[PDB]
Design a protein around this ligand. Sequence first.
Ligand SMILES: [Ca+2]
Ligand SMILES: [Cl-]
Length: 478
Amino acid sequence: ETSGWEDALKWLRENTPEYSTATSWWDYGYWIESSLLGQRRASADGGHARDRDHILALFLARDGNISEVDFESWELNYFLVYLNDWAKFNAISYLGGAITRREYNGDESGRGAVTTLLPLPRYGEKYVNLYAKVIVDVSNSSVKVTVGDRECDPLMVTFTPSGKTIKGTGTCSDGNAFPYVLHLTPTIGVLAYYKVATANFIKLAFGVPASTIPGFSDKLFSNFEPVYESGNVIVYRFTPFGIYKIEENINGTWKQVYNLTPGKHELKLYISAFGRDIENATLYIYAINNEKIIEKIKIAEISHMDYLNEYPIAVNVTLPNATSYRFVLVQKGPIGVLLDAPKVNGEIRSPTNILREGESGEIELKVGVDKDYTADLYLRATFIYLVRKSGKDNEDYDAAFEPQMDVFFITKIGENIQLKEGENTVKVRAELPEGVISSYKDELQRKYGDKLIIRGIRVEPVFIAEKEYLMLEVSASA
Ligand SMILES: [Ca+2]
Ligand SMILES: [Cl-]
């Protein structure tokens, strides 16, 4: 009765490191594996809690700059998008701050609600969502959309692979406004309210490069790589740093290549920085033979790169033989996966509020890692809160609540810790400055007044080491 969930999960356990981390909207991943099939491997296996629900939605429901959520700060490795989640997209869009309370579920007089997303499987020259009484007739190359009795005209219709784009009028024969966009693809079509027409979930789930920002869509598919799919579940491998385009100099002309051949090359690299800046990193190409690294070639050094304003990197490299090449970036990032409830002064605590403001104590942690790391250890705070961007107040149905995620390190309490592959134990003395939390919570209140709504304050322990990020792997060619 599974929608591919067991095939996908059961695939992850057999194809990813023992201490990987995955997420799914509303934790279907964890719930399927734990509650339905019985399982545990760490105090956590993915993201949880109502504050991540907000940030997960912010990513799924939005597009462009404001959707570049910092998944790396969660040491995220895999993302499982579930097609069926289209049915909940109204809530997802609401938590993600895309739509207002009214468009979410109507006002006091039951009017206004909208249908953010609606999938239209094919039928043959016709696309139709039986359950919603919607029919899309293209045959003749004009596109006729029937919604119930009415006849409605999109604000726009798109074809993919095609890329064609008819410009509708966004109105119904009812005379009413139909602010919807229709994306059509060989196997399915999707009708989407305008506020979520370019939604990343559409990009991941239904294969529609939907982006109101040039380049974004290419970059995003370099940060989220599909590695497996079953039914309505596609498992993507995240990476806050990837390469969406490799240009090679062929006769003083830059052309796009899709694999490299042994030998010297004059290249141009296009990196996508998803969620966080590139900070003092080193890039390498790893010649790979029989899935065996046979050489590590440093190719460049980026001191910094804006995550909302990348740029191409120039690089000349001589490459050995091997079957494939791996562009890797290495820089400071989070590592480790608590395997038990952290203890403080002997007692058990929450791995998300390890210490209270002002309180000090002896912290103990069982830490698992898939590689040998030398890391520092900090107490990092993470504020997740909403900021009402419309409406007279929080109850006004005009209200839409834009979710934010602020993360700052408070104090280093670890130092050159030699974490070795497998399980580890780390006892350390720590103290959380007096005021650090209330201080920030006051600065937020000062910036946003009543438009604010704290959803979750976290104070957790994080091991930061130099870690390798796989940006892209190409193949050796003739
Ligand atoms: Ca970016
Ligand atoms: Cl972080």
